[PDB]
Design a protein around this motif. Structure first.
Motif, PDB file in Angstrom:
ATOM      1  N   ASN A  78       6.055 -48.218 -43.849  1.00 21.42           N
ATOM      2  CA  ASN A  78       4.917 -47.480 -43.616  1.00 21.42           C
ATOM      3  C   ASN A  78       4.824 -47.076 -42.413  1.00 21.42           C
ATOM      4  O   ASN A  78       5.260 -47.307 -41.493  1.00 21.42           O
ATOM      5  CB  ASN A  78       3.659 -48.385 -44.317  1.00 21.42           C
ATOM      6  CG  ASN A  78       3.139 -49.405 -43.221  1.00 21.42           C
ATOM      7  OD1 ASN A  78       4.241 -50.121 -42.457  1.00 21.42           O
ATOM      8  ND2 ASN A  78       2.117 -50.036 -43.331  1.00 21.42           N
ATOM      9  N   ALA A  79       3.778 -45.796 -42.157  1.00 22.85           N
ATOM     10  CA  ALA A  79       3.413 -45.252 -40.961  1.00 22.85           C
ATOM     11  C   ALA A  79       2.674 -46.006 -40.041  1.00 22.85           C
ATOM     12  O   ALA A  79       2.235 -45.509 -39.157  1.00 22.85           O
ATOM     13  CB  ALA A  79       2.928 -43.807 -41.137  1.00 22.85           C
ATOM     14  N   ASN A  80       1.983 -46.964 -40.751  1.00 19.58           N
ATOM     15  CA  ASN A  80       1.199 -48.038 -39.947  1.00 19.58           C
ATOM     16  C   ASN A  80      -0.288 -47.046 -39.444  1.00 19.58           C
ATOM     17  O   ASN A  80      -0.846 -47.228 -38.550  1.00 19.58           O
ATOM     18  CB  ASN A  80       1.528 -48.350 -38.710  1.00 19.58           C
ATOM     19  CG  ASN A  80       2.976 -49.018 -38.646  1.00 19.58           C
ATOM     20  OD1 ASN A  80       4.058 -48.673 -38.089  1.00 19.58           O
ATOM     21  ND2 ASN A  80       3.024 -50.408 -39.398  1.00 19.58           N
ATOM     22  N   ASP A  81      -0.735 -45.913 -40.331  1.00 19.27           N
ATOM     23  CA  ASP A  81      -1.737 -45.267 -39.876  1.00 19.27           C
ATOM     24  C   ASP A  81      -2.952 -45.672 -40.925  1.00 19.27           C
ATOM     25  O   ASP A  81      -3.728 -44.546 -41.016  1.00 19.27           O
ATOM     26  CB  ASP A  81      -1.356 -43.728 -40.134  1.00 19.27           C
ATOM     27  CG  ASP A  81      -1.027 -43.300 -41.544  1.00 19.27           C
ATOM     28  OD1 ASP A  81      -0.539 -44.119 -42.420  1.00 19.27           O
ATOM     29  OD2 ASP A  81      -1.284 -42.068 -42.019  1.00 19.27           O
ATOM     30  N   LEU A 192       4.146 -60.146 -36.811  1.00 22.12           N
ATOM     31  CA  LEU A 192       3.438 -59.046 -37.470  1.00 22.12           C
ATOM     32  C   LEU A 192       2.991 -57.794 -36.558  1.00 22.12           C
ATOM     33  O   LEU A 192       3.165 -57.894 -35.163  1.00 22.12           O
ATOM     34  CB  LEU A 192       1.858 -59.532 -38.044  1.00 22.12           C
ATOM     35  CG  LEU A 192       2.267 -60.745 -38.922  1.00 22.12           C
ATOM     36  CD1 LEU A 192       0.678 -61.236 -39.388  1.00 22.12           C
ATOM     37  CD2 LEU A 192       2.815 -60.338 -40.430  1.00 22.12           C
ATOM     38  N   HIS A 193       2.575 -56.816 -36.997  1.00 23.92           N
ATOM     39  CA  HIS A 193       2.607 -55.572 -36.134  1.00 23.92           C
ATOM     40  C   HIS A 193       1.305 -54.599 -36.805  1.00 23.92           C
ATOM     41  O   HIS A 193       1.226 -54.570 -37.990  1.00 23.92           O
ATOM     42  CB  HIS A 193       3.798 -54.839 -35.984  1.00 23.92           C
ATOM     43  CG  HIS A 193       4.313 -54.147 -37.097  1.00 23.92           C
ATOM     44  ND1 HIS A 193       5.191 -54.807 -38.038  1.00 23.92           N
ATOM     45  CD2 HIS A 193       4.224 -52.852 -37.482  1.00 23.92           C
ATOM     46  CE1 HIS A 193       5.595 -53.783 -39.013  1.00 23.92           C
ATOM     47  NE2 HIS A 193       4.820 -52.624 -38.615  1.00 23.92           N
ATOM     48  N   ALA A 194       1.054 -53.861 -36.045  1.00 24.13           N
ATOM     49  CA  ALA A 194       0.054 -52.617 -36.593  1.00 24.13           C
ATOM     50  C   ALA A 194       0.134 -51.714 -35.212  1.00 24.13           C
ATOM     51  O   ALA A 194       0.840 -51.750 -34.136  1.00 24.13           O
ATOM     52  CB  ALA A 194      -1.310 -53.299 -36.675  1.00 24.13           C
ATOM     53  N   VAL A 195      -0.372 -50.575 -35.609  1.00 27.24           N
ATOM     54  CA  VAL A 195      -0.659 -49.218 -34.678  1.00 27.24           C
ATOM     55  C   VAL A 195      -2.041 -48.929 -34.655  1.00 27.24           C
ATOM     56  O   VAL A 195      -2.627 -48.894 -35.941  1.00 27.24           O
ATOM     57  CB  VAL A 195       0.303 -48.074 -34.981  1.00 27.24           C
ATOM     58  CG1 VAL A 195       0.293 -47.032 -33.921  1.00 27.24           C
ATOM     59  CG2 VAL A 195       1.790 -48.888 -35.089  1.00 27.24           C
ATOM     60  N   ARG A 196      -2.382 -48.471 -33.355  1.00 20.40           N
ATOM     61  CA  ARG A 196      -3.874 -48.177 -33.686  1.00 20.40           C
ATOM     62  C   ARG A 196      -4.056 -46.575 -33.894  1.00 20.40           C
ATOM     63  O   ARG A 196      -2.919 -45.853 -33.616  1.00 20.40           O
ATOM     64  CB  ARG A 196      -4.563 -48.365 -32.031  1.00 20.40           C
ATOM     65  CG  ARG A 196      -4.585 -49.754 -31.764  1.00 20.40           C
ATOM     66  CD  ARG A 196      -5.855 -50.210 -30.695  1.00 20.40           C
ATOM     67  NE  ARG A 196      -6.901 -49.277 -30.755  1.00 20.40           N
ATOM     68  CZ  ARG A 196      -8.285 -49.409 -31.212  1.00 20.40           C
ATOM     69  NH1 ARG A 196      -8.514 -50.637 -31.790  1.00 20.40           N
ATOM     70  NH2 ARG A 196      -9.029 -48.420 -31.182  1.00 20.40           N
TER      71      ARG A 196
END
Lengths: 226, 230
Positions: A78-81, A192-196
């Protein structure tokens, strides 16, 4: 060597573009690759996503790479958006940089069994353009074994920090990819990860963040498809 | 060999990296001796090469070196007799003396899906190429070799990036790409079923040449081929 022991210890590793040696031929290939983010299709209210995707059959020992039939529901990145037909463009696929990145990125992963190098891997390859218009996300996995992200471009953009979390869902690190070919590798079962969110600096124009993500999953039973 | 034959039938090519048994001591030494021949090839960006053709009967393992056909003769006859149409020097004495050359010629053949069992009793023409590609501090399109079956073995790679092999459908769509990187990494293919090409090599250290040495053999079923003088 550095990256794979850092994946072993910390589950991620950073590779800034300034640490990479770039010649005139390569510079030209990066520019032509990055130009593809201008011709992506929209979708799967302030935020937009443009995208293209495909899967490859990959055997590390021989370097064998085969494009697989285009199957939107077999994506997991996924684009993490799970969506519509949006294959990589002809000119993306004809750029030698694409598969060269695919093979080179893999050498940074700490593969647990040498025998896995002789098995097939499924490699998901995602082009994402993330768009944030004048303004009026939680940690997770991509469900692969190893991931890499390359920043292709960032335009008028504030925010967009990449975030590494512990499995207990606690924030352990935050970095911001800002230069073209700034790169992060990660062990998708380790963290785990994410993007702001991104948001515009100049409020008369959108913020845009262009990203290339590949996910690698060990698939010993995968067969070649004709 | 069984899996390779089926991979040729289904996909048109089959890969065999050196890592699954490269050599005991004796084999190892022959491989080094064979690979060393590429240091002494005739200059013919930069490509050096040598060539010969063999009469081969798979049933018996009989291998005969066919007489050298002079380029001037073929050129003036407008008839290359099914061989190459380029001016190339013959294989060296020490290439021909090395038992590994005969061993590779016979062993590679067992990976091909021969369509009729009776063909094992017919002669095959085997064209044998030593190629050295040089990119100095300073491509061919998709094609076929016009044989029934081919094999390529990497003899050596020096200061070289690039050189990825590409497999195309007969409609000229890229279906697979791989990279021979270790000495004796191998690929077999059905030359009527795919097209192929290779990407240019380039130097890693850009102040020195990149070099890629390959051994290629192409096998053609030739039931009318008769024995010739040796």
């Amino acid at each position: 060597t550095e990256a794979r022991e850092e994946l072993r210890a910390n589950g991620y590793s950073l590779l800034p573009a300034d640490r990479l040696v770039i010649d005139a031929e390569l510079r030209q290939h990066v520019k032509e690759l990055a130009a593809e983010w201008e011709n992506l299709e929209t979708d799967r209210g302030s935020r937009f996503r443009e995208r293209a995707y495909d899967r490859f059959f990959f055997v590390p020992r021989t370097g064998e790479v085969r494009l697989r039939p285009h199957r939107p529901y077999f994506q997991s990145m996924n684009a993490n958006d799970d969506r519509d037909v949006a294959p990589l463009s002809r000119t993306t696929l004809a750029n030698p940089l694409l598969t060269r990145l695919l093979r080179a990125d893999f050498e940074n992963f700490p593969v647990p069994e040498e025998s896995w190098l002789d098995d097939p891997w499924d490699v998901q390859c995602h082009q994402f353009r993330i768009i944030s218009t004048p303004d009026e996300e939680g940690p997770h996995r991509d469900e692969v074994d190893f991931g890499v992200i390359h920043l292709m471009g960032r335009f008028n953009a504030a925010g967009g920090e990449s975030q590494v979390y512990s499995l207990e869902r606690e924030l352990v690190a935050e970095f911001c990819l800002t230069e073209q070919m700034d790169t992060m590798f990660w062990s998708d079962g380790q963290i785990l990860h994410a993007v702001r969110p991104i948001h515009p600096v100049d409020p008369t124009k959108a913020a845009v963040r262009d990203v290339l993500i590949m996910g690698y999953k060990h698939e010993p039973e995968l067969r070649r498809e004709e």
